[PDB]
Amino acid sequence: AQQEAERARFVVEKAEQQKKAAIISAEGDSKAAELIANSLATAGDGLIELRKLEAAEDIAYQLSRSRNITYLPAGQSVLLQ
Amino acid sequence: FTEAVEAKQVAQQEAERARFVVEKAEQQKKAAIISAEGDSKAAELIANSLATAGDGLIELRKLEAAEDIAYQLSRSRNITYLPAGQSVLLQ
Amino acid sequence: RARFVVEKAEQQKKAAIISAEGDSKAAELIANSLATAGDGLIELRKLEAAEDIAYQLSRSRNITYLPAGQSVLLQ
Amino acid sequence: RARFVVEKAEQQKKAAIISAEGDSKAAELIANSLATAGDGLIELRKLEAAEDIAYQLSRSRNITYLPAGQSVLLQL
Amino acid sequence: FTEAVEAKQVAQQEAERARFVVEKAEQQKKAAIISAEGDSKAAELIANSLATAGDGLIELRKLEAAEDIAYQLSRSRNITYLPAGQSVLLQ
Amino acid sequence: VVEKAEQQKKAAIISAEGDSKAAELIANSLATAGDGLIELRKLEAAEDI
Amino acid sequence: AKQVAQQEAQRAQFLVEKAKQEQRQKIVQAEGEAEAAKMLGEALSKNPGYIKLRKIRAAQNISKTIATSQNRIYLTADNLVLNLQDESFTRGSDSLI
Amino acid sequence: KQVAQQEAQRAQFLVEKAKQEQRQKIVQAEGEAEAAKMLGEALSKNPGYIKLRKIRAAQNISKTIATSQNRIYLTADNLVLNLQDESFTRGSDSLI
C-alpha cells in the first residue's frame, strides 16, 4: 500500500529524471557538434590532425607508467624476455 | 516388473506435470507479447527519428560504449588485448 | 524380440508424428508472420541470444575467447 | 572349417541383402516424400543432431574445440 | 533515509563543483585559444615558406630526428629493434 | 623363391579371376542403377572405422 | 525380460503423451514468436537503427557479464580506439558523409 | 571346427538380427517421410523458422557446454564487443 504508492512515485520519478539527464546530455552533444561542424565545414580537418598528434603524445604519456602495456611493430612473430 | 510399473506411473504423472509446464509457457507467451510490444514501440520511435536524422546518434553511442566497455573490463586479469593481425606469444 | 520392436515402432512413429505436428505448426505460424514482416525478429533474437550465451558460459574455466583470425600462444 | 567359412559368407550375403532391402525401402519412402517436399527436414534434423552431438561429447575430456580454422596455441 | 538525505546533498554539491569545473573550463578555453593562435601563426609562417621552397626541411628534419630519437632511446633495456617485416625469437 | 613364385602365379590368376567376376557383377549393377550404393557404403565404413 | 521391457514401453506410451504436451508448449512459443514478428518487423522495415542501438547495448551488457567471468578472453586492441593514425579512424564519420 | 560351427550359428543369428533391423529401419523412415511432407511444405514458404530454431539450438548447446568437460576455444566475435568493424552494421544491412 504505502510501498506501492512509494513505488509509483519512485519509478515515475526515476524514469523521468533518467530521460531528462539523457535529454540534457544529448542537447549538449548536439550544440557542441553544431559549433564544431559549422567551423570545420569551412576550415577543414587541419585542427583534427593537430589534435591527433598531441593526443598521441598524451596517450604515450598516460601509458608510460604501466608494465602491462607492450608496443609491437605491426607484423612480428614470437619472443619473450 | 514392479519398477517398470512404477516408472510407468511416474511418466503418467510427468505428462500432467508437462501440462503445468504448458500453463507456465502460456503465461510466458503473454509476457513475451508484452516484451515484444516494448521492442516494437522502441523500434518505432527510434526508426522514425533515425529515418530523417541519420546514424550520427549511433556513432556517438559506439564511442561512449567503447569507453564504457574499456572501463567495465579494466578490473579483469583474465582479459588480454591483442593487436589486429598479431602472431604468437604467451605471458 | 519382434513384439518389443513393434511396440517401439508404434511409439517412435507416434512420437515422430507428434514432433512433425509440433514443428510444422511452429512453422506456418512463424513462417507466415515472416512472409509478411521481415527478419527483424531474427536479428533481435540473435542479439539477446548472444547476451544469454555469454551469460551461460560465464562460469566455465575451460572456455576461452580468441580474436577472429590469428592463433597465438596462451597463458 | 573352410566349409563353415563358405557358409558364413552365404549367411552374410543373406543378411546383407536383408539390410540393403531395408535401406532401399527407407530410401524409397524418404526420396518420394522429399521429392514432393524439400530439404527443410534435413536442415531441422541437422540442428537437432548438433544439439545431440554436443551433448554426447560433453562428458569427454579428450575433445577440444578450435575456433573455425585457426592455427597454433597452448593455454597455460 | 539516514544516508540518502546526505547523498542527495552530495549530488547537489557535485553539481556546484561541476559549475566550478565550468569556471576552470572557461579559463581553459582562453588558454586553448591562445595555443590555437600560436599553432595558426606557426602554420602560416611555415606554409608560406614551404609552398614556394618545397618540402626541403621536412626530409632533413626527419634525418636529424632519427638521430635524436635513436640517441634518446639508447638508454633503455625495454626497447628493442626488430627487422622490418621479419620475425625474431628472444636471443 | 622361384618355386614359390610359380605357385604364386597360379594363385594370382585364380584371385584375379575372382576380382574380375566381382567387378563384372558390380559394374553391371552400378552401370544401370548408379553409384548411390557407394555413397551409402562410405557412410557405413565411416562408422566402422 | 521381454514383458518387463513391454511395461517399459507402456511407460514410453505415457512418454508419447508427454511428447504431445511438449508439442503444445512448442506451438504456444511459436505463436508468441509470430505475433512478435509482425509487430517488430513492421517497425524495423522502416529503419533498423534500433537493432544497431540494441547491438551497442548488447555489447555493454556482455561486457558487464564477462567482467566477472571465469573465461579467458583474448580481445582485439582495436576496441581501445587508441590507433588515431590508421585508416579505420575516419570510417565512422565517413559513413555519416 | 567347433569355433567354426559356432561362427556359422552366429552368422545365422546375425541374419535374424538383420530382419529386426530392417523392421526398425523402415518404421523410422516412415515417420521421417511423413514429417518431411508436413514440415517441408511450411518451410518452403519461409525458412525463417529454422533460423529461430538455430538460435535456440545455440542456446541449448551453450547450456550443455557450460557444464561440459571439453576445452572450448571460441571466437571473439561472439561477445559482440568490436563496435568499430564492418560486422556491426552487417546484420541490420541484411535486414533491409
Added chain:
Amino acid sequence: REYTAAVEAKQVAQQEAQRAQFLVEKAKQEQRQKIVQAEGEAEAAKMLGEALSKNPGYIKLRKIRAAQNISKTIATSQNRIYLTADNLVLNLQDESFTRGSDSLI
C-alpha cells in the same frame, strides 16, 4: 504415497505458473522502461543528426577524446595490452608519414 509427493511438485508447478503471472507484470514494467529509453534516444537522434549531417568531424574529435579517456582507463587496469608501435609515431620514414597532410590536401 510417492505420487502425493508428485502432486506437491505439481502444486509447486502451479505456483511457478503464478510466478510466470508475476513475470507478466514484471514484463509490463520492463516495457515501460524500454519505451522511456527509446523516447530519449529518438529526441537525441533528431538533435544530433542535424548537426552531424551538416559536417561529421565532431565524431572525429570525440573519438580522439575517447582514445584519451580509454588510455587513462587502461593505464591503471589489470589487463595485458599489446598495442601497435605505430601509435608512437616514431617511424618517420614510411608511406604513412605524409598520410595526414595528404588527407588535408
Added chain:
Amino acid sequence: AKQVAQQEAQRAQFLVEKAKQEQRQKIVQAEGEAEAAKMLGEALSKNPGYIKLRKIRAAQNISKTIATSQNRIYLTADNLVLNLQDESFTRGSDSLI
C-alpha cells in the same frame, strides 16, 4: 526503505542538475575548439607542412617519454636508417624531385 529509494531518486534530480553543468563544460570546449578550427584550417589550407613538422616533433616528444617508461617496446630497425642498400633509401630524395 521508502525514503532511501525516493531520496536516491531526488539524488538523481541533483544528478540532472550536475548534468546541466556537464553540458556547459562540453559547450565551453566546443566553443574554444571551433575558434581553433577556423584559425588552423585557414593557416593549413596553403600547405600542411606544419603538420608534418609537428609530427616530427611529436616523435621526438614521444621518444623522450617512452625512454623513461615501464612500457615494453618493440620498434622496427628501419628507424635506425642503417640499410643503405634498401630500395627505399632514395625515397625521401625521390619525393623532393
Added chain:
Amino acid sequence: VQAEGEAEAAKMLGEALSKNPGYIKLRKIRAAQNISKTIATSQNRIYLTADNLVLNLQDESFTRGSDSLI
C-alpha cells in the same frame, strides 16, 4: 613368372572395370576398413583429419556426396 600372372590379371580386370570402375571404389572402401583394423593395433603415431568423423553437419561439403548422385 610374376609378369605372366599380371598379364592374365590385366586382361580379365581391364575388361570388367572398363564398364564401370565403381568396383574399385567399393574395394577402396574395403581397403580403408582393412587399414583401420591394422592401424588400430599399430605402434605408429597417427594424426588423422577430423573430417573422417563426419561430425561437421554445417560444412558445405556435407551435401557433396548426395550432390554427386544428383
